[PDB]
Ligand binder design. Structure first.
Ligand SMILES: c1ccc(-c2cn3c(n2)CCC3)cc1
Ligand code: NA
Length: 305
C-alpha cells in the first residue's frame, strides 16, 4: 500500500558498547551484529533469540557482511585488518592484512570468492577469499572511504568517501569507470547499488539521501526530513513489501520513505541514541535497526505490508 505499518517485535540486548552494523543472512535465518566492543553476535532473525558470539579482533569492529551461501562472515576492524569467519564453528579462517589504518566497510561479491574493503587510509582493496591475499589496491579517494559495494553480478564496485565522491570501479581491471558529482560535494557517508543494479543510493552529511542513475550520471530522487550531519548511516532498499527507502537518523528514529513520491511514510520510535544501522530482511517485511553508545540495543520491527 501507501504506508507500511512496522511495529516493534523484539529488542536484542548484549553488546556492551556502540553497535556499528547489522546484516541479515541471505537465507533469512540469522541476523549478524558487529560492535565497538570488538565482538560479532549472531541472532535469530524471526525470534530475536541470541545464538552466539564470535571474537578475535583486537579493536572495535565497524562492519560485517555475509557470504551468499550464508556460511561465512567478513568483518572490518579498527585494528587495520579484516577477518573471514566460519559462522558454524566460530573459527577465523583468514586475517586480511594490508590496510594501513582503520578498515571501515566490507562486502562479499555475489559469487563470494572476492571481498571488497574500504579504509581510513583512503584506499579500496579487493581480496581473494580462499587465499586471504589482496588482489588489488585502488587509489580510490582523497579522504576516508565510507562505503563499498558490489553490484548484482559482481562486475562493478561502488565506493564513497568524505571527499564528496562516489566512484564506480571495474572489479576485474581495477579501473575507475565513473566519478559522480552533483551541484555540490558534501561528504558522502554511504553508498550502495539498487537490487537491479541500475541505480546507486548515496547518503550525504547534509541530511540528504539521493538515488542516482549512474550510467547516465543523473540524480533522480532526493529524500530528506531526517538528521544526518555526523555519522555514516547505512541505508537500504526495502523490496519485500512496498518499495521503500530505509535509513537510520541522528534523531534516534528509523525513517521509511516512499521511493517514488519521496514522502516519509513511517518513522520508527524506540531507540535512545543515533540509529547508525538498518537492514531489510531478504523475504519478509522485517527491519533490523541498531544504535550507538547510549542505547546499545538492536531492534526488530515487523510490518504487514
Ligand atoms: C560507528 C561505527 C560504524 C559506522 C559505519 C560503518 N559503515 C558505515 N558506518 C557505512 C558503511 C560502513 C559508523 C559509526
Ligand atoms: Na549516512
Amino acid at each position: 500500500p501507501v504506508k507500511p505499518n512496522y511495529a516493534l517485535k523484539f529488542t536484542l540486548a548484549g553488546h556492551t558498547k556502540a553497535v556499528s552494523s547489522v546484516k541479515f543472512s541471505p537465507n533469512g535465518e540469522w541476523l549478524a551484529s558487529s560492535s565497538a566492543d570488538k565482538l560479532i553476535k549472531i541472532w535469530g532473525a524471526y525470534d530475536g533469540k541470541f545464538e552466539k558470539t564470535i571474537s578475535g579482533h583486537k579493536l572495535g569492529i565497524s562492519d560485517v557482511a555475509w557470504s551468499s551461501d550464508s556460511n561465512l562472515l567478513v568483518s572490518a576492524s579498527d585494528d587495520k585488518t579484516l577477518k573471514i569467519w566460519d559462522v558454524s564453528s566460530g573459527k577465523c579462517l583468514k586475517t586480511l592484512k594490508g590496510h594501513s589504518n582503520y578498515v571501515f566497510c566490507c562486502n562479499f561479491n555475489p559469487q563470494s570468492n572476492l571481498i571488497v574493503s574500504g579504509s581510513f587510509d583512503e584506499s579500496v582493496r579487493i581480496w581473494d577469499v580462499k587465499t586471504g591475499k589482496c588482489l588489488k589496491t585502488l587509489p580510490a579517494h582523497s579522504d576516508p572511504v565510507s562505503a563499498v559495494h558490489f553490484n548484482r553480478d559482481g562486475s562493478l564496485i561502488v565506493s564513497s568517501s568524505y571527499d564528496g565522491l562516489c566512484r564506480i570501479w571495474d572489479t576485474a581491471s581495477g579501473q575507475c569507470l565513473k566519478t559522480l558529482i552533483d551541484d555540490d560535494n558534501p561528504p558522502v557517508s554511504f553508498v550502495k547499488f539498487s537490487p537491479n543494479g541500475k541505480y546507486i543510493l548515496a547518503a550525504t552529511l547534509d541530511n540528504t539521501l539521493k538515488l542516482w542513475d549512474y550510467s547516465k550520471g543523473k540524480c533522480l530522487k532526493t529524500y530528506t526530513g531526517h538528521k544526518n550531519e555526523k555519522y555514516c548511516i547505512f541505508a537500504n532498499f526495502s523490496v519485500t513489501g512496498g518499495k521503500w527507502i530505509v535509513s537510520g537518523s541522528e534523531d534516534n528514529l528509523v525513517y521509511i520513505w516512499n521511493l517514488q513520491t519521496k514522502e516519509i511514510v513511517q518513522k520508527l520510535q524506540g531507540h535512545t541514541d543515533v540509529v547508525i544501522s538498518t537492514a531489510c530482511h531478504p523475504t519478509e517485511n522485517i527491519i533490523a535497526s541498531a544504535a550507538l553508545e547510549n542505547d546499545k540495543t538492536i531492534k526488530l520491527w515487523k510490518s504487514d505490508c
